[PDB]
Structures are given as structure tokens and as C-alpha cells.
Amino acid sequence: EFETLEQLKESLKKEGKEIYDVEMKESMREQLLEKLPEIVEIEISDRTLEILVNEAINRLKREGRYEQIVSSYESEEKFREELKERILDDIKRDRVIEVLAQEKGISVNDEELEKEAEELAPFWGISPDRAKSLVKARQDLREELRWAILKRKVLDLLLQEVEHHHH
């Protein structure tokens, strides 16, 4: 697997016609996010991961989606093993994204938070003013929005740094 961000970016290079794909945003972000965990190391206990796996499963059970999901696996043990690796990858991914934001001087201001809340409003089924007030009132929601915006900016910047082979 990749050892440096530069090696990762090199693997994302495209050539000719396939460069101009209208799904560039979603597609590239997906592969970028999938490979990012490979360039960082996290020193965390297996116990911590077991705990995170339980909490994820408890959440799935509250959503009523656990059995449908675990049933698709050979056993619950197998599912837990997969979920543990996915969780570790998320932890690695978030660390990489946070560090790149710091290295690139990227941040999020209230103006950006407000704009994003306005755009989310219709999906939430509430007015733009209602959405902006919720974000201003709930720290948890505000932190989630801030991170979503930051992560998107970091991913977009990285993708825009990939030098493709133009014909």
C-alpha cells in the first residue's frame, strides 16, 4: 500500500478523455478517501476498537438495521472484524484530513457554516433561518457541519493538485 501522499496522488492520475468525467467530484473523492488511511499510523488499543465496534452495533440496533446487516455476513464475529477495520480506517482517515487541513492552512468560519446551513435547510425540511439557528444553538451539530465543510475542502484541494496526462 501507499506510504506517502505523493504516491497516492500519482495513482489518481488520469490520461486523455477519461479526465473530463462529469462525476469527477464524487468519483475521485471516493477513491481518495478510501486510500488515505494507508499513509498514516495510529497507535490505539484493540480494547478501544472493541468498544467502538459495540457502540456502532448498538446504534445499528437502535436504527433497526443491525440484523439485516449482520445477516449478510457469515457470522457476527466476521461482521465485528470487518467493522473494526472500517472504524480504524475512519480514525486514520480523520487524522489525515485534520493534519492536511492544518498543513494547508484550511479552516471554516461562521460565514461558511451559515451558508452550508442554508443549503441543508430544504433537505432538513425547515427554513434557512431555522437551520442557521439550530447550528448556532447546538454545539454537536455545529462541530459536525464544520468538519463536513473542512473535509470537503481538503479533499477538493487534493484532487485539484493531481496532475493528469492531458492530450
Query: Which domains occur in the chain, in start order?
Result: 1-167 (1.10.3120.10)
What's the rounded Cα separation, in Å, for the pair 3 and 11? 12
Closest CA to 145 of 72, 153, 24, 6: 153
Chain breaks in the chain following residues, C–N > 2.5 Å = none
Q: How many helices (H) and strands (E) does the chain have?
A: 8, 0
Query: Which grid cell sits at 156?
Result: 477538493
What's the rounded Cα separation, in Å, for the pair 45 and 22? 42
Closest CA to 54 of 84, 93, 82: 84
Cα–Cα distances in angstroms (integers) from residue 81 to residues 22, 25, 47, 115, in the given order: 36, 31, 13, 39
Residue with cell 477519461: 18
Q: Give residue 75's identity as a one-letter amino acid code.
A: S
Specify which residues 15 forms β-bridges with: 165
* Method of structure determination: X-ray
Residue 45, C-beta contacts closer than 8 angstroms, at least 6 positions apart: none
Q: Resolution to 1 decimal, in Å?
A: 1.7
How many other C-beta atoms are found inside a 10 Å radius of the C-beta of residue 86?
Answer: 13
Closest CA to 32 of 65, 13, 61, 8: 8
Dihedral pair phi/psi, residue 104, rounded to 5°: -95, -5
